[PDB]
Amino acid sequence: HWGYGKHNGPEHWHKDFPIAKGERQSPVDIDTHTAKYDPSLKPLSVSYDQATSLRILNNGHSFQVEFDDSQDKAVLKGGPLDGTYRLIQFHFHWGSLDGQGSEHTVDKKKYAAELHLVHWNTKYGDFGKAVQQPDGLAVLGIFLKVGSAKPGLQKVVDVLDSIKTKGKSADFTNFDPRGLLPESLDYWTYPGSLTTPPLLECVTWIVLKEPISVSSEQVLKFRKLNFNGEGEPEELMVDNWRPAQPLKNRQIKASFK
Numbered sequence: 001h002w003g004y005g006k007h008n009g010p011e012h013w014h015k016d017f018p019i020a021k022g023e024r025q026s027p028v029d030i031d032t033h034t035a036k037y038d039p040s041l042k043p044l045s046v047s048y049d050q051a052t053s054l055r056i057l058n059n060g061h062s063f064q065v066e067f068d069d070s071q072d073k074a075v076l077k078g079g080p081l082d083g084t085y086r087l088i089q090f091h092f093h094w095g096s097l098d099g100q101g102s103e104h105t106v107d108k109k110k111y112a113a114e115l116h117l118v119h120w121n122t123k124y125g126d127f128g129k130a131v132q133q134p135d136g137l138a139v140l141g142i143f144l145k146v147g148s149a150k151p152g153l154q155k156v157v158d159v160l161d162s163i164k165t166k167g168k169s170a171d172f173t174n175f176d177p178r179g180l181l182p183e184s185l186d187y188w189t190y191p192g193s194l195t196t197p198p199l200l201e202c203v204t205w206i207v208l209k210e211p212i213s214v215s216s217e218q219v220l221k222f223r224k225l226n227f228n229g230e231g232e233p234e235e236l237m238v239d240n241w242r243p244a245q246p247l248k249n250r251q252i253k254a255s256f257k
């Protein structure tokens, strides 16, 4: 099946998922000089105080932390968005080296990793219906650079040895995703897609300008995860990022001057 290797990686995905060569694919390079400040953007509202985390899962291509989205508990509103989008999960993309790993790039700069907080538009009733809609998802993308440790990432790092291999999960209740946010909510936004198969074109991307800093030790522990299942030979889960795709007929808007 699809993956990130030479024989099943991003350059192969279009064969099963022809939308891979579509008109609004993600990620993209964010050219900071050509992004347009947009006065029509409303303030971004990240309301995570009532977030209810459930479980952490190695899904064979990343690890994901899942949330209870049966009610409006952790939501994203405002910015480019109309209506209320509920947090369903977050996951990461990262590199084998500190100079690569992010999916979006900034003036072609790659960061060590990228966090995706995935939300769905509650007018569509459930996540599976939302992905079939052009405005179904809002994903908040946050870059990670290597420097000082991020305290609010450490509870995630500490449980990774319990989900080393594909299909392993662990309880992950009472985790506060507010600890993963940078100070500033300044962002760029554009219409795009899921960056993994099925690559559906259902995502309003909101990528924050300010990266979070994480320690070399924290990112090293990401890189000890496995793509393989238990009792198979070890393939380190590294470089699980899709590279930048053609911008095509899109403008990236900035929330700031």
Ligand SMILES: O=S(=O)(O)/C=C/c1cc(Br)ccc1O
Residues within 6 Å of the ligand: 088, 089, 116, 118, 139, 193, 194, 195, 196, 197, 198, 203
């Ligand atoms: O916008 S993405 O970060 O690519 C979200 C991806 C994604 C999220 C969920 Br939840 C399920 C399947 C998926 O492919």
Ligand SMILES: [Zn+2]
Residues within 6 Å of the ligand: 091, 092, 093, 116, 195
């Ligand atoms: Zn992602």
